[PDB]
Known about the structure:
Two copies of one chain form a homodimer.
Chain A: E1 2-4, E2 10-15, E3 18-24, E4 32-33, E5 42-49, E6 52-66, E7 69-77, E8 84-85, H1 87-90, E9 96-98
Parallel strand pairs in A: 3-8, 4-7
Antiparallel strand pairs in A: 2-3, 2-6, 5-6, 6-7
Bound molecules: the ligand CC(C)(C)OC(=O)N[C@@H](Cc1ccccc1)[C@H](O)CN[C@@H](Cc1ccccc1)C(=O)N[C@@H](CCC(=O)O)C(=O)N[C@@H](Cc1ccccc1)C(N)=O.
Domain Peptidase A2 (chains A, B): 20-89
Region (Dimerization of protease) (chains A, B): 1-5, 49-55, 88-99
Protein name (chains A, B): Protease
Amino acid sequence: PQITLWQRPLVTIKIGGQLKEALLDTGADDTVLEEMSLPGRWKPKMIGGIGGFIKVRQYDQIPIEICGHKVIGTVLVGPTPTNVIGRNLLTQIGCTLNF
Amino acid sequence: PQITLWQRPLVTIKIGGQLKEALLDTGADDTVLEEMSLPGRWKPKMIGGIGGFIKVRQYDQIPIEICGHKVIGTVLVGPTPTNVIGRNLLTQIGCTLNF
Ligand SMILES: CC(C)(C)OC(=O)N[C@@H](Cc1ccccc1)[C@H](O)CN[C@@H](Cc1ccccc1)C(=O)N[C@@H](CCC(=O)O)C(=O)N[C@@H](Cc1ccccc1)C(N)=O
């Protein structure tokens, strides 16, 4: 699809069996999702953004379907206001910026 | 261009004669920059990211050049670790997310 940016680029994602909404963010190196129970062992880590650092639980090799397209990669879980799909996953659906 | 996301989408931006680099951020509503010592009045405001909130100064009608594309828009100046071209300016250059 071609998504114009007049409004926030929110798309449907399916993770851990549930449908959620997530923001396609080209400015995020990583994927950060709101609190949720995920399978497997996690590692504590810290990522930084505009207002500083937050603590996150890192899950590796998690499968996610972004608008029907399957991807598998690291997912960081923590106190984020909203789900952010980052470059680590965007590259897997062949997502590109065009102008 | 059609830009892939294997590395941060950094581009050249010219503003007030000064050349700089900024991140094409589809996850940012606004364009946020380091101090650009811009002339004119501004309005203080708060914006947030991952990690908390920051205080910025809002400057409207700023002539800015992005990849040879000339646009005019609101620039928010403040303590951001990196320059961000948000959707307010990404739309002005006809930028879309595609996959
Ligand atoms: C998620 C990780 C992996 C940590 O990456 C970044 O945060 N990368 C940031 C760039 C950066 C790199 C290095 C250092 C510093 C900054 C992007 O801006 C991330 N894009 C979104 C992520 C996001 C979206 C939604 C909620 C939380 C976080 C963002 O910060 N967007 C801000 C950018 C600033 C701006 O546009 O004004 C935004 O849209 N803020 C809105 C929406 C908002 C409001 C309240 C709270 C949170 C967000 C606002 N009006 O303040």
